[model samples]
Target: ATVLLEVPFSARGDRIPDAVAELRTREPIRKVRTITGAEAWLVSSYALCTQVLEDRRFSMKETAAAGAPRLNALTVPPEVVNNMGNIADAGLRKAVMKAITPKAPGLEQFLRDTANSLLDNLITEGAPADLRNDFADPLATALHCKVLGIPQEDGPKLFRSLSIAFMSSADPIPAAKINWDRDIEYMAGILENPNITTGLMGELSRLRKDPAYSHVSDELFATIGVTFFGAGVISTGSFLTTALISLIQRPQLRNLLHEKPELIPAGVEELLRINLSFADGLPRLATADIQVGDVLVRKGELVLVLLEGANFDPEHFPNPGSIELDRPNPTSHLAFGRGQHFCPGSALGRRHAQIGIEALLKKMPGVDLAVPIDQLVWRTRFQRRIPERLPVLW
Candidate 1:
């Protein structure tokens, strides 16, 4: 008797399930049940993952269509599903994109300074620090606050909403709703506040007042602030948290990077390529019948593109589990995704991790797990695979 394997095979942050490789080989495009109990095609293998992502027919926005088979329940309002698309439609895409770029004047220095400040605090407190709570998350929160032109003091309140906001659940999360409404109100207040005159939110505030863009709804302006802040903070924090785990476990790799500081960028890309930060597969709703590998995915059907499948596929990346700084095709991984909906925050994210790792190595070159790796509790049914508390020692 065969049973259906659920979409998220495991939530362990320390390692990817071997089942990922097994499925990629035996059933690259196979049926699976999501936590929502909706059956969807789970696309494994590098080729098929890219095929689905590159095709506009498998629409991220349409995933929120009424009665569409769901991979998980919506945390935000259904209309907010196509967040980036909405920004584009409202003519704010250019400004938002420009704001998030790593190349923004003084942005990299902000990241570098933040990373060092966080590390200094940890060092002052001494050994057995929880890196996730004390370092990685705070860095992410501060970065987003600075980027969004919000007060650093207000960062923690919005960050507190994420645990519920990014849940992967079968039923509606009541807390998620409560937090979303509250966060939206905060973002709305930011627009009307007199002090916000810099960063993304400030630009949004200016645009909202401009007669040229007056038709844009206040709802969108608030949604942009909430969604961008939540998405950026959660993704960057979770990724750096897990990437730290990957680095800590491989002392040899850590030593290599520490010895040659210039190799940190390449190392960061490899870490991104191997990260299991996304807890569930990327979900999209098919708008039309599309042939993906061996399956004829029907319109309005759900599809979950497994990132680890494409990332760790041995065919594309030889010795996929191992991190090689000089891979012939580096930056080819779907870590930031592909095609239209590829992550706009990617440059910023890479810089965050690069500066973070660089700073950490210089401060605590011998950083390693304080407790057994398995002792770290992994957050389940959440957007990312990350430890609840990453205990570490220098």
Candidate 2:
């Protein structure tokens, strides 16, 4: 067995492109150890990744199952696992779906208004505005607040808290334990409050009282809230910023979408497929021995599916480097993970990107990068990939 270290596996933010390229050419399913020192298989094929994702044998319920193999010792508890599923249940899912679903005619307008308002503030201030801070982050923060029912005034505070909590890497053991305690305490307080009307709090209140869902626990309800807060803020914020920058870099694409607004929706999927925002896909623990390509993954072994690799896999997507907004079946790409654990927020994320980018083009068609693209900083830590600053002028 040979260990070829092409790039540091932990260097998630900057080295993904290199890693993906390596996986595609050298080792699509290679043996590697994670930062936690857990041995795992890195699965990069489109067919295999989807196959594993849809397989119920790779159970998320493993945290509850006795004698399940531990990926690391830091696996979230079964209580949290059960709580997560409850939060992801149909009722709560419907509430979130209502907030961002394009069919809710008003929802699109709401996002449009929010995006335009943020851009208005950016332009009024001056040129060379940081798109990430002034536009993308604010728009995402506002949309999440609207969905979650957080007051506008407290959006900044909640955003900061959630971002910090997710991005922290101070020794996973102690940091996670402390963060879990803090989150539970905070959620407990929110559950007790009567006046909080925004977000999962209100939804949880209704669900808890509903006789049909009498088995749902406080922890489960709280898990739903945590998932929404954690997943919504960073990914939405980062993707919005990345999409904007991608358009600014390729103004022709912006013009193409502006000239044909109908293409905006499809273009959103294409942009997501091309951009490496997620950098990596979901991790699964093999419940039984399986072969990915020629590599055999033993039972209980960890496997990482690189979403970027699958999307860029030339075998499936022709001319993998180019962006084709009208590519038939653009949604087929794995921008959102496939199968059971696929991103529940995919609809909301696409809506935000579509509305946000459309608003930018409509309001500032002549927008150009105020700073050279290479000069922009990129966040190197954590799962969310984003430019540090995106400055543009019209």
Task: Give model 1's TM-score versus the native structure.
Answer: 0.98
User: Any idea what lDDT model 1 has?
Assistant: 0.92
Per-candidate count of clashing residue pairs (backbone under 3 Å): 0, 6
Give RMSD (Å) of candidate 1 vs. truth: 0.9
The sequence of per-residue lDDT tens digits that candidate 2 reaches over residues 1-394 is 9654422244323234555676777777776655444466777777777777788666565634555433334334555555436656635666655554444545668788998888888888888788888888888888876676556665676566544454423134555556666666666677677887545567666667789778766776666665676578788888878777777778788899888888888888888888777634456777788777787777776677778778888888888778886676688888878777777788888888988888988989899898766677766435667777787889
Q: How well is each residue in 29-142 modelled by candidate 1, as lDDT tens digits?
A: 999988888899999899999999999999999998878899888889988998888899999999999888888788889989999999999999999899999999999999
Which stretches of model 1 miss by more than 4 angstroms?
none
Identify the runs in model 2 with alpha carbons over 4 angstroms from their true place: 1-19, 61-84, 88-105, 168-170, 173-186, 196-200
**Clashing residue pairs for model 1:** none
In model 2, what are the clashing residue pairs, if there are any?
83-220, 148-198, 148-199, 149-198, 149-199, 377-388
Worst 10 residues of 1 by lDDT: 99-108
lDDT against the true structure, per candidate, is: 0.92, 0.70
